[PDB]
Structures are given as structure tokens and as C-alpha cells.
Structure 1
Amino acid sequence: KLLLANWGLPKAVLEKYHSFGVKKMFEWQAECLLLGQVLEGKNLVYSAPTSAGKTLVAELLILKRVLEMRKKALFILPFVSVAKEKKYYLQSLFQEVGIKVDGYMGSTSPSRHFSSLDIAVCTIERANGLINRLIEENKMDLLGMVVVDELHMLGDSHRGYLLELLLTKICYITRKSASSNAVQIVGMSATLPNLELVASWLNAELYHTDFRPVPLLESVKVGNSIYDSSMKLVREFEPMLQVEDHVVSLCYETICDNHSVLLFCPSKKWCEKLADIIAREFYNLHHQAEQKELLEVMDQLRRLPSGLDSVLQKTVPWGVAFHHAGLTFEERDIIEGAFRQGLIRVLAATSTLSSGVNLPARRVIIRTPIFGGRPLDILTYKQMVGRAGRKGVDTVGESILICKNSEKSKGIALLQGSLKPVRSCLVTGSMIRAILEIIVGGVASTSQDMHTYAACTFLAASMGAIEACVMWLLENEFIQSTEKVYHPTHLGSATLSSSLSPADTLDIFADLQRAMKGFVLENDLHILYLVTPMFEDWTTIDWYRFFCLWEKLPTSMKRVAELVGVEEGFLARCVKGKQHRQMAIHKRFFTSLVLLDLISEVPLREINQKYGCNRGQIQSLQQSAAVYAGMITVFSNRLGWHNMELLLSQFQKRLTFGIQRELCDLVRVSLLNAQRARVLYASGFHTVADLARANIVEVEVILKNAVPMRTIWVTGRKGLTEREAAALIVEEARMILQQDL
């Protein structure tokens, strides 16, 4: 029984698994999935270490559910990058067996409809919208199982409350049908203390494991000695070569052992300095003063849109790199891609890598217990170290936290600490959407039943103001009051369909309706002004630099600013010598100005030099602003505004890829991101229609030129050869022609 072949799986799936190296099944997964009545329909919640293989239980459960009862399923993942990686893994796994998978990661939407789509591996923000749409036209029989990830994020988080709302809605719809389970709910979590309460909230049978494929031993150093967690000295620290911190020495111990190291750094500036030093310390400690594959990785960065970084130039060709938020969204995969293969040996990363993709490393070093001026959180610390120890390669995983003076007392708190218990995050702006997701979907109409909905939520199961907050929806025209029985309105029916929080829609409805009075069409700014989401903390603005940009803007552009409240009299004038809604407009204006260059195909390096915001926050802004244009368009569609939908129809695709109107059809190929279609456009190919009929040898030469054997890079498949990618461009464009008609 302790072998995958005994368990019921398709032959192709098992063969693909053997290719991935997973041939032995853990005992905890087998006992958990055999435990209870989970297989026959009962929903399940369990927790395991990150390196223990949490994904196996969910994957075999969803495969069994799909093969047993033909029903579409979901897959809820926090971030866009992890969602993309998971979708690619699931596609490579489910190609032959026939369960086509596609994802809704913000801007990108599957070409095929959800009826043909089976497993929608998509983020929470779009999973909630898809669940709402499925609820809308009484088509929930397709849903058979929803897979959630890191249920511990449903507490204090900017998007986990959406996951909690979706799960409680599914539980409500399941209980209502009882008037074995219609839809199953499975998830995985970290070492939560209260997971029984969450498991019983979804009436899920609980199981918690601390099993690890390789041992993990945390460590803290005190000067020139290493202390274990429980007041124990496990080893005496002795630096071999260096030119109290001794940060370089720890990597050197592992480097001579032929293994990698993760050196997580606190801040943006700290990442560059630390990876520079280790490469500089590799000048003398190994020269007294795979190379072939390292150059190719260095070659991969040469013809990226932003080229190769100056700081990376002095470090990459020795096995030392670094990866933070400020780096390009393209470089981040390549640098992380080589780490899996082992080309790179030391990384200088920030805290963002903790919740990102899986990056195994024998030794993980954390520079300071203080991350960004605040103590390190326990929840991120569990995933912070959990990467230590490769399955089947390394017999020991370690973590060496670095503490100084009195910070050791705060530094040691995480070693003996435990993950904080989850909350509900539920007047509350996170709950105004909760009922409005159900009152306007037609699922619940009577108020007494709507009260019973609040009994199905996390807050009720944890153990007043629910009814009084409907009156708030009564005030804001969201719900019309009749004989009580609640019915949706025009504004309310649109908010649910486009998946916006009702807090935002109050301003958007007044802002989108203020575009009637005066609209401009010569420049895309005013259209772009209505799709910039917010300002958040994407970048620190430079007032003086915006002054010089304000003067050099064309007279055409200066008409938009006065049309949306931006003042020529006050713009980087009174701030220098020294209104909450005004800064939310100026920074909305700046976010539209940056996006104007992004849709004008200005090079990212030139934009960085001109806009002062590094490329890390630019690709993290055009990705977020692309989702907004796809939500404003849908919001205007349901509201009976056909004209505004016409102008904003094409602006989701333009922001995603940073292209112009001419390349809109060409970019439908996933292998033409921002430059592989522009040079291809200049080659006399203006549409994806005739591109499918292109000469195979013709596209080889044209793609070789325009440089800013696997030298080209396409997202999802790591590096690729020029001949293969060009052959894939025509192949990808080929299948588009008939599958959409």
C-alpha cells in the first residue's frame, strides 16, 4: 500500500510523477487521505511543513474527484507568480490525461470559456469573482471541489478575507441544498495553533503533522559561537577566511561542501551590497588575486528589456547573484531558475522571497531579526526557513539567524515562538461585500435567511451588527427596499459582476459618471486615468522630478489634468515648502503618466531614468493596473454604459504587455511579451492571422536581430533556443486560428 502505483492514478500521471522524481509517498499523506470520509465527499483541512510536500494530498484528492465525478474544480493561490508556476506544473501534469487547466491571474483570462475549462488555477481575487459568476446563473453544479491554499492567510491579510468569504459562501450553498457533499473544500496551512476551530468551521476532519523529509535545526549565533534553540551550543563558530558579523564565512562553509546558501537581506539597498561583497570575497579566496552554463545564464540577461544590471555584472559570473522586489519581473525567474539547477550558490534576497516560489537551499541565513524597522513576524518566519533541506539530496537543513547586542532577546523569540491564531477580519468594509455577494446573486432573499448566513461565517463558528449594515446598503442605493425582501439595483448588480469592493464603487460610480461632462480622446491619459487602481506604496514619489515633467508635458496632456482635478497651480509647488483626496488624485495622475509611457513602449531603462521608479515597481504596477481596467470595463458593461466600455475594452491588454494598438492581435501569442512582437511587427507581419502562415526560416533571422544555445526566454518554460521559440511562435499562432472559430 506504501507506493503510488497501488493508489488509483492514471498511467500518464504516474509516469509524469516519475519524471518529477516523486516516487515515494509519505506515510502522513497516506494516513491522512485514508483517514475518515474525506474521499467520498467530506471536506478536509490539514497542515504540514512546506518542504514536507503539502501539494501531494491536494493533487491526489482533486485527481480522484475529477476521475470519479465529472465536475469542474478550483485552485485558490495567493500570488500571481506562484499561481503561474502552479498552473504550468498542473498543465504539464494533466496534458495527456485530459483535464485541461487554465488560470485567472488578474489580467490574463483563458481564451476558452469556463464550461470547457476544468481546473481554474487562479488567485483569490479572481476565484471569488468566478464563484460569484457561477452562483449568478444557477450553474454551480459544475463546481465539485474547491482547493484553497494557506488558510492561515484568511485572517489579517489584504486578500485572505476574500478566501474566507468564498469558503463561507460555499458552505452556505452546501447547507442550503440539504433542505454526500455537493462541493468539497480542501486546503493546506502552516503550523496553525487553532486549526481545529477552522476545520470544524467547515465541518472538516482535522489532521496536523510536523513530519519533515529532512531534519531541520535552527541556530542563533552569539559573537563567535552558535547557539541552538533550547539554550544549547551545538557548534563552535570559527571563521576560515575573511577580508563580529562574519556574514561571508557561513556561505564559505557550505560553498566548500558543494551546496547553496540563501542570504536573506532586510532592505532594497542591503541586497546589492551583500551579494557584491561575497563575489568580491570570491576574487581572492578562490583565485589568489559550471562556467560554461553560468555564462549562458549571464547571456540570458543580456537581451532582456532592461539588459543586465550593473550590480549584477560584477557578481553573476562567479555563482553569486541577488533577487529582491526591485528587480525585473523577468530577471526574477531566471535568477530563481538557475538556483533550482544549482548554477548560483548564494542569493541576497528580501522578505518577499519567503512567500514566493520554492527555492531549496541547504543553509538559510537571516541577517537581522528586524526587517524593515519592525520585528520579524512569526508567520513569515515559518516559511522563511522552511526551504532548508532538499528532498533526497541534503541530509540536514539549517538556519543561522544573526543577532547582535540586545536584539538577541527579540531575535530568540521567533525560535521558541508559535504562529499566531487566525482571525476573521469581520462596521467592517470586509463584510459589506460578504452579504452583497449573496443578496444580489439571488441565493438568499429573506432577511431571516440572511441572518442564518451570518451563522455560517467564520465569526459565528469562532464562538449583532450584521442586520444594521444592510441598512448601510439600503442608504447607498445598492439594495432597493420592498415588502423584508431585498432586491438588487443597477449599481448593486454591477459591483458583484465586476468583483469590486463596495467601498471603492461609491467613488468610481461618481468618478466614471464625471467622465461624461468632459472627455478627451487624442491621448490615452484620461482613459488611463480611469484604470489606475490607487497609489498604495508602489513607489516613493519625487516631487521635483514631476515638476520638470509637468512643464514638458504636451498641451494635449495638460488638458486631462485640469479635467480630473489636478491643478497646474498646485503640482509639486506647496509640497516642497511643506487634502487626503487630492494626493489620491495627483498620485492617480502620476500612475496614469507612467502607464502612458508603458503603453507607448518606452524602454524600461529610459523610463527608470526618467520616472525615478525602478523596474521592480513598474512591472508590479502595470500588472495591478491591468486588472483594474478589466474590472472597470465589466463594471461599465453591467451599468448600461456601452460607450465607456468601447474605449476601455482594449486597455486591459495594452497595460498587461506594454504594447500599442497595432500589436494587440500579435500579442495574443503568449511568447511575444513586449519586444518579440515589435520587431516581428516591423517584419511585415501585422496580424496573428497571417502569422500562423509565416515561413519558419523567415522568423529566425528577424528575431535574432534587435538585441538590447538557449538564449531566448519565454515565461513558464525557463530558457529556450532561438530556433525552437520561433518554431513555437508559429505553432502557437497556428492553434489559435481554428480553436477560437
Structure 2
Amino acid sequence: DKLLLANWGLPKAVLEKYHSFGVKKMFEWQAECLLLGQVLEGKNLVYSAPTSAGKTLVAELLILKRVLEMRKKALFILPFVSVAKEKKYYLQSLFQEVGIKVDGYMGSTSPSRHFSSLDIAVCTIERANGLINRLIEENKMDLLGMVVVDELHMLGDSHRGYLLELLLTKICYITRKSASCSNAVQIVGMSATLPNLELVASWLNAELYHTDFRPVPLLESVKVGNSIYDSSMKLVREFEPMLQVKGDEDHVVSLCYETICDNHSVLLFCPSKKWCEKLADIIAREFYNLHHQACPPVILEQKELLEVMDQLRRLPSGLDSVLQKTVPWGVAFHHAGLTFEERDIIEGAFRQGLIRVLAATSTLSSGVNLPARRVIIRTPIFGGRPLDILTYKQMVGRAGRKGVDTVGESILICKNSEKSKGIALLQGSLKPVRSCLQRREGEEVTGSMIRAILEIIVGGVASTSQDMHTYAACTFLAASMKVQLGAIEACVMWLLENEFIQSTEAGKVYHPTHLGSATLSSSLSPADTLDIFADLQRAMKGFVLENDLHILYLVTPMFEDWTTIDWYRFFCLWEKLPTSMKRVAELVGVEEGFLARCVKGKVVARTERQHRQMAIHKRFFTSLVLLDLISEVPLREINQKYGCNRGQIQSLQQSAAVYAGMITVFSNRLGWHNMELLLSQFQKRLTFGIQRELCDLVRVSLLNAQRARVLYASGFHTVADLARANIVEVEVILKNAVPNMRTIWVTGRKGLTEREAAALIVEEARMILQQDLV
């Protein structure tokens, strides 16, 4: 037998840690994937297995093979910051004991370790591409030995999807060019079972592995009326409801209750925030009725659920008025309107089995591993459309708790009017992946192709048109075709006419300008960079230093439907808005006659002139919300003042802090030294949402804006003075100022006691000095 990780011969420290995770023995498919010929010898690999099959273990063992037997660095590229955070702390708590230094590049976060000191960088797609562009700039591509790509099916039709192709095409081009005129950078890709996954493997010259193995079977089925029908439209059951819930006709509450009697846990995907909250309220009342009616009674581990409510109540947002009534029973909800900290606690309490029913929006289906014993889906229609089969299979694939269940179950609840949509979701299979670089009818260029051509010219890895046609032959567009020769020339002509690149006589040799080099280094989209450049110049002709709002208008993103603006509120603020802020508004182009039109009725954009005229006002409203964040105005007071949800504000922080970083590097490369001197404070300041003084203390990763303000209020104004602090004094400050059941929540950890958090804070401050002095 050679399926035990001990016989595979891993380092002792990771082996013992894997045993502590229960990973005693790998699946036959993982061994068969790792023994797939040259895969263990550096050839690229692409494999697809169900997410619950433990698919990432194969990538983790290949990272060891490329960071130990070669002392070369590896990227781990992930679709979302939460997944990147979770994977970062998992990899750290696994590999740190062999000395492999894991850190990561995700959102506005950046490591205090320089990349030369890393072995593994856990990246989001956008931060990975920015990293590779810098390694090309530095001529340090010799430092990479691997790239691991999760969710490689993201490669198609997505706003950050093509960045994954633009990354992998550059890695392929530079390596294959170096060989043509051992695989240097092993790419490991993980995907859904796309029908054209052979093509992606052949594009990457990868070995392909596919399996449909799941560690527990999956009774994927549909319910209509009382009848529950199989995917083949055999009858599975006729559902007698255990509970006569009078308020709801689809029996969903009794369909949850049916398995809760077994002490199993249910996950319940709902079309919308209000449908989740309405449904979680109903289910909790039926558990309350059932408890007094006591059809077995529920046992709820009640003392632990009280701790969950205490942790929630000690967040800056407090205990949600709907969570207050549901959570005591082990019923809750999970939706994009909650904070990240509320969601992380509620995800944790569901994982621990304290919360037994969770009504969730579709956004849970991608960003977390929550295994559930039933996955109910309340309708085949979501957001006014049929479900995407990728989303539906991301939902249903969460049925079955690995090693706990015999089989997973999923019920699509379906009306008689919807049965044809329902069966189509059950039987349907994913669309083949197709790249964004296919310019549509009526398009001469695409922003993805322009960025591709810019990155190679400004990076210098393609200089002539002979090289640009050679680069394109490495593209998944070409591999899918195997027009494009014209698409290259059209993109070159746009960059030339604006002089992001300058043409010179040899054929033609093309070189960047400073505007090209700045737009590359910023990672801004070059089509937008013409507006950003002209905006920043026009600000420098006359900048209002009188407040930070004119800076916030420049670092705030373009509007992204992050909220629905209440224009009657906005104009009623525009009266009270301070004159030092209405002076900014005049400079940036906000107009109160157009606000009156927005109050008067619907306003629309027929022209690009009218599109920006509206964007200017939405961008100003966003900058006011940021100005309240930047001044530590509580999220409840921002909500009441502007109408935003907590999760809308907290997600605006992430994009504004990312964008504040880009605009700093853009101004730095152009040499607007007076702008970068002003802008550079705002990335950290927006990320946490703090005054200028907290910005030093916040360097401690245990301190958020709340904990930094209580330490600043006590007198620990700086990290050096905090490192001096007596641990008992930090304890007493936290013990007093925050208002042992894990009082404090730390996003990288479970909840901490006051004694544990205070000691870790002081020792982390001392370590930061050691790292800063070194």
C-alpha cells in the first residue's frame, strides 16, 4: 500500500500536521493524478475533481515538490480575498514548520516580507498579474518555479477571468520563447469539468486528469407538489410534511424540519436578502413553537449559541435585529448585507454545528467550504433569471458532509410553472469555456486584448509586430481557433495614437511612453487611464487641501451599483454639506440642477456626455460615504445617513483601497510627486477606515479600527510604545473599553480571550520592531 502520505514520504512536520487534520490517506484519484506520468516531473497539470473530493491536496503536494527540491518560488492564485485569506492561514499553519515562508498579495493587503523572502505568494488574480508584470520589469522571472491556479474555469467571460489568461499566456510565451528561440514554470490548474478541458490542457501543454469521484453520493433531486422526482424523472418520494406550517405553501420549513429531527444541518439558498431574512424568521418561530409544543424536540447546545450572540453583539455592528430572534434556536441567515465579521462568525457557527439551518444567498456558493446535509434551493429562478448551471452545481456540490453523511441530498423546490426550468438545471451541463479576447461583431478592439498588447510592449517582451503575432499564437484564443492578426494591429493602433507606446523606424519598433509605463505599473485599464490622467491633471491645476474630500474623489472607484442611491436623501444632504466640501463639488463638476432632476424623476444617459455627467454625481456620493468611513463614523450611522447596508460599505472599502493603491503608483511613475505624497496615506486609511493617527498602531494585524482606537485612547499612540506595554495593562484596557466566551474576534483565528489577544498583540508589536529594524 502506497496511499498513506507517510509512504509518499512528505516532510515529517507537514505529515504530522496532515494527520492532525485527519488526512491520513489520499484518494486513489489523487495518487492516480500525481502518478500521471511527467506531472511529478514538472510538466504542467490540469485536473478537475468535485470540490468536496479534497481536490487541493494534489496542488499542495506539488508545491512541496517545487519549493523544496528546487528553491524556487510559487504563486497560489485564488478568485476571492476571503478564499485567499483562508488558504493563506491554512498554508501558513501547515508549511511554516518546514521553514517555507507563506505570505500573500490580496486586495489592498501587501506583505511586510519582500518577495525575495517568500517561498509562496497566495494571490488574487488581479494581484498575481500585477506581480508577474513586476517580475518581468525586474527581469526576475527566473525566481518562479510554479504557478497554482484554482478555479481555472474562471478563465472565461469574467471581469477578472481574462487576467488569468493574460497571466498564463505571458508565462507560456516567455518560457516557450526562451526554449524555441524541463518545464521552467510548472502550471497546476484546477477546474470544473468543462466539456473542453482537453483544450485548456493542450493550450497549457498540460497533462489532463478528470474524475467524477465524490466521497459521499449525491441524491440530486427535484420537488414539485408533494412529489419528489429524480434527475431521470423517476419518483423518489411523495413528501408528507412533518409540520403543518400554515404561512408557507411549499413545505420548505417542514422540509428542513424533516432532517433536523436527525440532528443534521440544512443549507437553504434563497433568491434575495429579504427572502433569506423572511424565511429564517419563519423557521425560527416554528422551532420556538416546536419547543413549547414538546415530532421529536430539538437539542441545541444552548450555551454555545449564547456565545455566538455575545460575539456578534460585541462587533461594531452589534447583534442583528433578525439574528437576535433566530440565532438562539440555531437558525440564521447569510447574505451580502451582513458584514464580513458577521458572515465569518455565522459560517463558523454552522461549521461547528451550532447553527442547524442557514438561509443563504447564492454568493455563499462560491466563497466558502460549508458542507451541508441537505441543500434546498427555494426556486429555479434567481434574480429574475434561471440559475447558471455553474452556480447550481456549486450549490448542489455542497450536499453531503464528508465522513459524516452516508449520502448528500439536494432538493430544488420547483413550482408546476417552473418544472421545465428545474429539470434543465438538473440534467444540464456546463458551457465550454471561451475567452474574452474574441472581439465581437462591431468591435474593432477589446480591453483585454489591448491590455495584452500593452503588457508585452511596455514590459518589452515583444517589440516588433513579428513578436506580437508570435505572442498571440500562445493565446487561448489561438488554441481555441486552432482576424486575430488584425485585432493585434487595431490594438497597436489605439495605443500608438494615444502614445501609450511610441512607434519608431526599424518594420516598426514600438516603445512605451511614460503614460504607457505608468498605466502598466498601476495595473489600471488603459481605456480608463485617459480619463484618470486628465482628471488628475485638472485636479493639480487647483486642489482644495481644506479637507480630504477632493482626495477621496480621486481615489474613489467608478460606480459599480454598489448601492441604490436615494437621490432625495442625497440632495437633502447637499443643502447641509459644508462649504469647504461644496467648493470641491464645484471643482469636480457636481451640479445641483442635475440633482434636482434626479429628485424630480428618472434620469437616463443616451450619450457618453450624459453617461459621465451622471457618473460624476454617483462618484461624489460615494466619496461622501468614504469620508464618513475615513472619519470612523459608525456603520450604523452611515447606514441611517446614506441608506447603505453594512456589507455595501465594507465592500466599497475594499475596492476604494485597491483603487487608492493604483492611483498612487500611477502618479509616482508619472512623477506627480505632490500627488503621491497626498494620496499614499489613503490606501491604509481606507482599508481599515481610520484617522491618520491610528495608521501606525494598525500595523499590528490584531488591531482593527475599534481596538486601535481604544489603545490610542488609553495612550498607546505608537507601536513602539505598545511593544513596551505591560500585558496586564493591555488586558485591562480591552476588558474595559470593548464593552471567557472568546470575547474578541480575529479574522485569522477563532475568537480570543482578553489575556490571549493582549499577549499576542504585545508580542506582535515587538516582532514588528524586530522585522522593521532588520
Same fold (TM over 0.5): yes
Give unmatched runs, 5+ long, in structure 2: 295-300, 438-444, 603-609
Shift of the alpha carbon at 1:292?
A: 0.9
- SS of structure 1 residue aligned to 2:410: strand
Counterpart of 2:606 in structure 1 is: none
Shift of the alpha carbon at 1:572?
A: 4.0
Q: Distance in 2 between matches of 1:573 and 1:234?
A: 58
Shift of the alpha carbon at 1:468?
A: 2.2
> CA, structure 1 residues 574+253, in 2 after alignment: closer, same or farther (shift >3 Å)?
closer
Deviations 1:342-381 (A, max 9, x none): 1100001101001111001010000011100011001111
> CA, structure 1 residues 518+537, in 2 after alignment: closer, same or farther (shift >3 Å)?
same
Q: Is the 8 A contact 2:694 2:705 kept in 1?
A: no
Q: Distance in 2 between matches of 1:687 and 1:706?
A: 18
Deviations 1:270-305 (A, max 9, x none): 010001110001011122281111100111011101
Shift of the alpha carbon at 1:32?
A: 0.9
Deviates more, 1:563-572 or 1:466-475: 563-572
Q: Is the 8 A contact 2:556 2:622 kept in 1?
A: yes
Shift of the alpha carbon at 1:236?
A: 2.2
Shift of the alpha carbon at 1:452?
A: 0.6
Shift of the alpha carbon at 1:520?
A: 0.9
Shift of the alpha carbon at 1:97?
A: 0.7
Deviations 1:588-620 (A, max 9, x none): 101100000001001111111111011010000
- SS of structure 2 residue aligned to 1:37: helix
Q: Is the 8 A contact 2:568 2:599 kept in 1?
A: no
Deviations 1:76-111 (A, max 9, x none): 101111111111111111121111111111111001
- SS of structure 2 residue aligned to 1:401: strand
Deviations 1:97-150 (A, max 9, x none): 111111111111001111001211010010000000001111111111011111
Q: Identical aligned pairs, as a percentage?
A: 100
Deviations 1:368-401 (A, max 9, x none): 1110001100111111111111111111101000
Q: Distance in 2 between matches of 1:676 and 1:417?
A: 50
Q: Distance in 1 between matches of 2:175 and 2:556?
A: 38
Deviations 1:247-277 (A, max 9, x none): 1011111111111000111011101000111
Q: Distance in 1 between matches of 2:244 and 2:734?
A: 46
Q: Distance in 2 between matches of 1:262 and 1:44?
A: 34
Shift of the alpha carbon at 1:623?
A: 0.9
Give unmatched runs, 5+ long, in structure 1: none
Q: Distance in 2 between matches of 1:577 and 1:628?
A: 32
TM-score normalised per structure 2: 0.95
Q: Distance in 2 between matches of 1:51 and 1:242?
A: 35
Q: Distance in 1 between matches of 2:449 and 2:665?
A: 22
Q: Distance in 1 between matches of 2:708 and 2:382?
A: 41
Deviations 1:669-701 (A, max 9, x none): 111111001011010111111111101110111
Q: Distance in 2 between matches of 1:619 and 1:193?
A: 37
Shift of the alpha carbon at 1:664?
A: 0.6
Q: Distance in 1 between matches of 2:711 and 2:570?
A: 35
Shift of the alpha carbon at 1:705?
A: 2.4
Deviations 1:421-449 (A, max 9, x none): 00010011111001111111121112101
Q: Distance in 1 between matches of 2:343 and 2:227?
A: 35
Deviations 1:211-243 (A, max 9, x none): 000001111012012101001112221111122
Q: Report 1:146-545 matches (<5 A).
A: 146-179=147-180, 180-243=182-245, 244-288=249-293, 290-426=301-437, 427-463=445-481, 464-483=486-505, 484-545=508-569
Shift of the alpha carbon at 1:573?
A: 3.7
Q: Is the 8 A contact 2:567 2:598 kept in 1?
A: no
Q: Is the 8 A contact 2:225 2:416 kept in 1?
A: no
The ranges of structure 1 where at least 4 consecutive aligned residues each deviate by more than 3 angstroms after the TM superposition are: 572-575
Deviates more, 1:450-459 or 1:561-570: 561-570
RMSD over aligned Cα, in angstroms? 1.0
Shift of the alpha carbon at 1:575?
A: 4.4
Q: How many corresponding residue pairs?
A: 741
Q: Is the 8 A contact 1:44 1:185 kept in 2?
A: yes
- SS of structure 1 residue aligned to 2:692: coil
Shift of the alpha carbon at 1:577?
A: 3.4
Q: Distance in 2 between matches of 1:720 and 1:242?
A: 42
Say which structure, 1 or 2, has more relative contact order (CA 8 Å, 6+ apart).
1
Shift of the alpha carbon at 1:574?
A: 4.4
2:600 is the counterpart of 1:576: yes
Shift of the alpha carbon at 1:649?
A: 0.9
Q: Is the 8 A contact 2:468 2:488 kept in 1?
A: no
Q: Is the 8 A contact 2:496 2:502 kept in 1?
A: yes
Deviations 1:35-90 (A, max 9, x none): 12011111011101010111011111111111110001101101111111111111
Q: Distance in 1 between matches of 2:453 and 2:17?
A: 43
Q: Distance in 2 between matches of 1:20 and 1:431?
A: 44
Deviations 1:320-342 (A, max 9, x none): 01010000111010000111111
Q: Is the 8 A contact 2:371 2:399 kept in 1?
A: yes
Shift of the alpha carbon at 1:538?
A: 0.4
Q: Is the 8 A contact 1:378 1:417 kept in 2?
A: yes
Shift of the alpha carbon at 1:456?
A: 0.4
Q: Distance in 2 between matches of 1:574 and 1:320?
A: 41
Q: Is the 8 A contact 1:546 1:572 kept in 2?
A: no
Q: Is the 8 A contact 1:451 1:467 kept in 2?
A: no
Shift of the alpha carbon at 1:19?
A: 1.0
Deviates more, 1:336-345 or 1:288-297: 288-297
Shift of the alpha carbon at 1:317?
A: 0.6
Q: Distance in 1 between matches of 2:500 and 2:189?
A: 34
Q: Is the 8 A contact 1:75 1:147 kept in 2?
A: yes
Q: Distance in 1 between matches of 2:244 and 2:642?
A: 40
Q: Distance in 2 between matches of 1:261 and 1:573?
A: 48
- SS of structure 2 residue aligned to 1:491: helix
Shift of the alpha carbon at 1:206?
A: 0.8
- SS of structure 1 residue aligned to 2:87: helix
Q: Is the 8 A contact 1:440 1:493 kept in 2?
A: yes
Q: Is the 8 A contact 1:225 1:235 kept in 2?
A: yes
TM-score normalised per structure 1: 0.99
- SS of structure 1 residue aligned to 2:661: helix
Q: Is the 8 A contact 1:321 1:344 kept in 2?
A: yes
Q: Distance in 1 between matches of 2:600 and 2:424?
A: 43
Shift of the alpha carbon at 1:706?
A: 3.3
Q: Distance in 1 between matches of 2:729 and 2:436?
A: 57
Answer 1 or 2: which has greater helix percent: 2
Q: Distance in 1 between matches of 2:528 and 2:562?
A: 19
Shift of the alpha carbon at 1:549?
A: 1.0
